[PDB]
């Protein structure tokens, strides 16, 4: 039994352009086992209708998924990714920062 | 194509 904790990265498809439509991404990787919970958040609320790619793993056998949804950056709106996994005491939230 | 047969462990 090996466990690896997820690496999270919240980021947009295109550079953040207030008012300009985009795609919000939560990229989770390097985790084991493969059971994971990922929610996109808009000001703390869970965004419905999110999408993710096909479960796949990499060379060191760790899994990775991309979770995403279409959205529109605003200077006010607060976005995040909330992730859960056996290796985590509690879900981890990482805030979208258009700078990354 | 994926391999025609897999190993039986």
């Amino acid at each position: 039994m090996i466990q690896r904790t997820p690496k999270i990265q919240v980021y947009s498809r295109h550079p953040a352009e207030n008012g300009k439509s985009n795609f919000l991404n939560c990229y989770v990787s390097g985790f084991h086992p493969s059971d994971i919970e990922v929610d996109l958040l808009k000001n703390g609320e869970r965004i419905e209708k999110v999408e993710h790619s096909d479960l796949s793993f990499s060379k060191d056998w760790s899994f990775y998924l991309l979770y995403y949804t279409e959205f529109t950056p605003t200077e006010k709106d607060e976005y995040a990714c909330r992730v859960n996994h056996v290796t985590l005491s509690q879900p981890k939230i990482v805030k979208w920062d258009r700078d990354m | 194509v994926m391999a025609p047969r897999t190993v039986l462990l």
Partner: protein, 274 residues
Amino acid sequence: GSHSLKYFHTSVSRPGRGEPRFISVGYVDDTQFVRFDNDAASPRMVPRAPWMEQEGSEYWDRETRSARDTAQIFRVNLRTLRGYYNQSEAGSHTLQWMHGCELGPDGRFLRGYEQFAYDGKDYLTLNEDLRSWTAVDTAAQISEQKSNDASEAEHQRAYLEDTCVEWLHKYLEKGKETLLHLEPPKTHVTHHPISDHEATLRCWALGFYPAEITLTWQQDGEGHTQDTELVETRPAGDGTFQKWAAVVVPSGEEQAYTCHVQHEGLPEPVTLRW
């Protein structure tokens, strides 16, 4: 260039809800083109790329059986291993299998490989010569002898040496456009100051393909590099990737620094300055 045809298989046991989950995704380097998901609303092998749409029933049927069969052997496998480790049937376990073949920049076979892992760890690996196996546990030794007495490496070698390369060929053809087309990185620096006397410079590479890329922050000549934070290359979601390197500079000195970006879709390396 240089190419590979590779598959990744994962089987996960589901105690309460019966029959284990089995997933299977294939790749022509960096591009997924098929996938099987015994969970999907269609437990069939489906194309994931569009150049794969031009494939006839024969193929999809055949590959669907292949995946189904492996899922079945993988479910037997999962039981055997639960045995070797004297494990409760009430817990979940993962059997993964990855295999692939590679071509030389010269177009033919190069190297081929195969491996199994269980609960996250290496379990059995087909050796370099492709005629033997290396167990990792003692449980694995049983799987190892079983294996040799059966002659699995022989089969595996054939597939790996012909079949796999032969089809890689055919997929490269059918993916001529997409696959052989490189997309260089739109690039740019950004300034985000920290203290009264220093800021972060972030070099950005966006929209490139394939994913191999290299970013380096060197200061005026010597290109010694100072701790540079490099986020793990990532997918944009459109087929392209993104990546960025950051370094901390003392305000005023932002020119002493230059970022070099390397990528196949660039006639030549690109330098950026803030």
